[PDB]
């Protein structure tokens, strides 16, 4: 790609500069270039990739929601511009999903990174699902569920129930069930089981881990309260 001629280490350095400058499209492009070098990502690098694209897609999602709200209240212009933003958002999600399928997931060297990437695959199919319609939406929903479920299977075998990545996966998968798949009972069951299984082990954690885990447990609780 456009970053093919730049050293991997230079791309990582420039991603960090872009973050300091709040230039998230640049940050994402640098991180894409780094992924495309074909080497695994460290934990810090995975987080850089996720932060960069979350900022990009997050801005597009917020704009799409503004435009969709105007459209629903309402010539063809609002629809056309909503569709333009929608196509750009779909492009970014397709880019992220392409990095995960080629080849971050299959090259992930440990269970934690594999769960991180399968969760991310679920998340980006979920973002697609928010704007999809008809048969395409149904396929996207099934793809999201399959990625999340694979991540769940690995995290139950390989990670303790208080592990923050495992907890965040369960949080986002339960949001998927509720907001996307019209499965509130699955959402509640998953959040509840995850909350209880983590609570059982909170006393074994250090001060920092306790804070990390109860932070995400509190995010599960907020959703349960909204849902229950």
């Amino acid at each position: 790609g456009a970053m093919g001629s730049m050293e991997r280490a230079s791309l990582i350095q420039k991603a960090k500069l872009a973050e300091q400058a709040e230039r998230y499209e640049d940050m994402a492009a640098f991180m894409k270039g780094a992924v495309e070098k074909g080497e695994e990502l460290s934990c810090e690098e995975r987080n850089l990739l996720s932060v960069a694209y979350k900022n990009v897609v997050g801005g597009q999602r917020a704009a799409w929601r503004v435009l969709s709200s105007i459209e629903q209240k309402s010539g063809p212009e609002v629809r056309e511009y909503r569709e333009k933003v929608e196509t750009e958002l779909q492009g970014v999600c397709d880019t992220v999903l392409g990095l995960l399928d080629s080849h971050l997931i299959k090259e992930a060297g440990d269970a934690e990174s594999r769960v991180f990437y399968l969760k991310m695959k679920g998340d980006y199919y979920r973002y697609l699902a928010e704007v999809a319609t008809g048969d395409d939406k149904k396929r996207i929903i099934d793809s999201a569920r399959s990625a999340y479920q694979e991540a769940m299977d690995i995290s139950k075998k390989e990670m303790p129930p208080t592990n923050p990545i495992r907890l965040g996966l369960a949080l986002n998968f339960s949001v998927f069930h509720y907001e996307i798949a019209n499965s509130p009972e699955e959402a509640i069951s998953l959040a509840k089981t995850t909350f209880d299984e983590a609570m059982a082990d909170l006393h074994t954690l250090s001060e920092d881990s306790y804070k990390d885990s109860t932070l995400i447990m509190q995010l599960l609780r907020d959703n349960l309260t909204l849902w229950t």
């Binding site: 949080l171 986002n172 949001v175 959703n223």
Partner: peptide
């Protein structure tokens, strides 16, 4: 409903 904020 909010997802993980990072």
């Amino acid at each position: 409903t909010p997802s993980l904020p990072g």
